[model samples]
Target: MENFKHLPEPFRIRVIEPVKRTTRAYREEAIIKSGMNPFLLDSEDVFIDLLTDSGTGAVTQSMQAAMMRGDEAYSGSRSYYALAESVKNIFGYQYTIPTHQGRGAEQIYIPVLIKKREQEKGLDRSKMVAFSNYFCTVRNVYIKEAFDTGVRYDFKGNFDLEGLERGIEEVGPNNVPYIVATITSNSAGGQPVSLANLKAMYSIAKKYDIPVVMDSARFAENAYFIKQREAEYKDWTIEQITRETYKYADMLAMSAKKDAMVPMGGLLCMKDDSFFGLEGGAMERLAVGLYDGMNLDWLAYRIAQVQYLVDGLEEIGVVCQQAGGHAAFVDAGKLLPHIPADQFPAQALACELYKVAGIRAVEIGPAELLRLTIPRATYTQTHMDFIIEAFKHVKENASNIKGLTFTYEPKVLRHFTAKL
Candidate 1:
């Protein structure tokens, strides 16, 4: 059914979109007009857009067909019920709240989580802490509460249980609102938080009555790492491993757009109705106008395609950490050691990627880290080969790659619009 030699995709390409290559001069002009910010570039101007996997990935024919089955209603939509059931069956959450996307869930849930906990405890239990690579929006949520968001970056490709232990001790346990563990830590080069580390973290949280919530964006990829690296779970299926991973946490906030293979959707899963009662009604009211229905088949094919790209990236020595299922992190610091951090080597490399290979990659943080985030159900081995070859070009021309200084920087999330 498949050809290993050519690395065939399991699905057929039903449609084709045209991408063009422009001259170096044309690209330079384009970048200048956009203030050297990749986000400002047009899709028509670039060849491959690797800005993010969230809602940027392609959908399949079955997903297109499933769209027709959507039941759009002000209330009591069958599709909503179907999604709720699936969330429970897969995530083991007794309650689910659908959101427009990841940030939507984060906006409502994070504030509500802090407010409710503070009210219930009759004090300000408003602090939040994350292991590492916490999403930007999650941090934004905590800012409103005047809580200093603490992140432990000591651990490499693993959870910093010691950091959590230290944080809880420093910030009174009662003041600690929640602990967040992002699987496949994106901030740390897409590293995974081991199952052992999660269990240990949970035990520590129990001592303080703190709830451990997951920033489960690239969770399936994290589970794949557990199966491959963790000896005890060698035989466990992705579903089984994913279920067990969530079991360690009290609740999870998933950007289903990332792992679920949907173009747009997010799910907030909780064990009980504590956070779900009145909040659920508010969430439903907010969600009804935002998104219609999610396609079930999109989630079905999301992971396998990610596996395909990861394999291809691994075949070439053009990546940072061992391939995390969601994206390929490029260490621009190492890749272009000549460039200075103040100059934004990562952003420079990202620019060079677009100019040299027409591949649009986004830089993570201020450091020299380029994230080649593969969209779900989109891209094939052939596309991967093009990206791999592009990196090879960058490697060959590393010396010529210059650093960048910000011409215009925003106060918040400056990375999104900073010009080099």
Candidate 2:
């Protein structure tokens, strides 16, 4: 049994949207028609979607009210000021370049970071490495899609202090472009880097004179984990936790969709004035999309939902990350042995869940594990109970599921569009 207390939903429902229920026969046909890929399945066909926490979350009334009061001039929006204020207050970065999504920020900043190495007179950029703190999805994916392709990926799950210092010390400091610390390393099944860990990393980075860029999609999630688990930070409020956490970050890139509980928006923030008019910098690449703003009220309940879900899943034979705010990792390899790893058993489990229970989830490949991400302000403890029951059924009839084939893929970043 774990020590964390249950968190009841923070507020009663303000509105309800009718969700369609479908039969298993229809689901079987639907899954087959969609090339047996969960990504291809329509929302109407699925009952519970654990696909991703990004942009699938619900918005607060304050967000709607803020939009209602928005002043959207073409060049300047008063809303941008408020967001800039929020970004600075929460992220400790003075400049804000708002983007449509986290990936938008990726497009803006990727070229800028690599341009230095690209313009080097003596060498081809392909031979050079654009190093940042280890990242999985956004930065690394964009790096793989570079001219833009000259890259060296730092690979440690939680940015292990020793691994980080050793890698930097071993290499000449110039080889590392910037340190992009992904809070709660999303790729590592939501493994988080601690505040104390960051503090020490900051010292090492300071020693080497390298700047740190925080991939802060789940910054609040990391902050909450720090508050609950860390000894020295136990008394700090979420705002305080976040304020101190970002104090170590030289720049911040955020997909506000995750922790801000916004439907869509992104922030590229830093105090550096140099990037403003630098050719191909964020200002050149970014055009502010619709602003959803930001808030912190749902955090208490967000963490509790995962705690409750993880605890419930653990009661059965299911194995997953014991705790994380965004999602928990299911050991798909251990859970489904009949399915071959090469055939994508993680996605095999995904299809089976749809076949057995009409639930939709996504796979994290390269390492086959089903990531069941929790969207904020959606579902409940009862929904979690339903999930546990579905998983229980899947566990009982595990042998029935089979592996999937990659029907179509790309030369670069094919995971999103790959068919099975």
Candidate 3:
């Protein structure tokens, strides 16, 4: 058996920019360091094992147990029951439903909630109000779809609360059903919307008879900050904070891959049963007649491992969360003071980090971040210079490399195609 404990720690890398770049970039480099351990990635299992934690098994196991007990993911299996029970016990919600994945749950919940609010109030679909932020895919989709069809009037823009209030006033005639906000709004920056602010936001929503649905992707971390800084939750445990924050939400969705610290899959928690009618009954016929919606049998282990990873991160001193993604290292704050991991900076930091740490790190953003990805050991100033030079070399001497186009479509077509 290959034991990974014997691997040596790799050298820490720092990027150097000559006069060709700027001293500003160099000075900024001093502040950035990655939370990743170079030695960990040297062990193949470290990288592969993290992802292997995702599958259908965890979901199926929880589902099976829940089915046998005649309850939902709550009040059923130990694997999942706790998540929902915690929600109920803590949040004071009468009903909760768990979905296969976070966004899938969103797909089902968004339309149902919108229609429910409109139908309950005896209003036209166009009289529905949705509060959104700028640059969210859901907002974009809603605007494109809802506004066009007169089904929804979206008050969407930067997350300015006063402006949001004005927008709410603007849509006064409509029955504002809900406002959807993302936790830590990933694409913008690892910035967290405070629970206090959200509670106030929910107050505004309730005044307008609108329910609030929060994206809890960064719920745990957000809860930590809330407990620390906010007096209202100063004495609350993390789980309690989770429940309390969820108290105001009509529904919540999360990416297990990110916040759950799991390898694959996600979680969808809704404090309502209107949308899931008969979906549970239909699950048994589709998923081996299992009463619970644990149709994804392969993801069970991954969910268990997610619990373990959450434990591991908490055990270590690492805490602060990046706006849109995760850092493998537990004490991310220490790394932040050293690394240039700026808000919404794309994966340039992660890519450069790989060169320094000699490991793999997935960052937010597509091509912009992907282009910056580098091996961990390559982050030295000398190495960065090498890359800056290499890119320049590749660009200026494109003819020599043959058939390589610097300005090309699909700048990063795909990775891992060559195999590790």
- lDDT tens digits, residues 246-309, model 2? 8887788778677766666677888777544111122221122112222234666777777688
In model 2, the runs with Cα more than 4 Å from the true position are: 1-5, 116-133, 136-158, 275-297, 321-325, 340-344, 400-420
Provide the global lDDT of candidate 1 against the true structure. 0.65
Give candidate 1 regions above 4 Å deviation: 1-7, 23-29, 32-35, 125-158, 276-325, 328-347, 364-367, 394-420
Query: What clash count goes with each model?
Result: 0, 2, 39
Task: Put the candidates in lDDT order, highest first.
Answer: 2, 1, 3
Model 3: CA > 4 A from native: 1-83, 122-129, 133-159, 173-177, 272-420
Error of 1 at 119 (Å): 3.1
RMSD of each: 7.4, 7.6, 14.9
Ranking by TM-score: 2, 1, 3
5-111 in candidate 3: lDDT tens per residue?
Answer: 21222322233322222242432343232122222232321221121212311222333333444323323434344444544554455454555555665776677
TM-score to true structure, per model: 0.74, 0.79, 0.49
Candidate 1 residue lDDT tens string, 1-420: 664433335567787778777888888888877677777788899888888877775655545555655666667776667667666766688787777677776776667766666776543534543333255113211111111113323223455556567766865666666777777665433555678878877898789887777888777767766876688998887777877888889888767666555666677779877764122333333233122112223333444555555555556655564345456666788888887778988888888888877788887644467777766556665677787788888888889777777744445665465455
Displacement of residue 156 (Cα, Å) in model 2 is 10
List clashing residue pairs in candidate 2. Answer: 133-180, 146-149
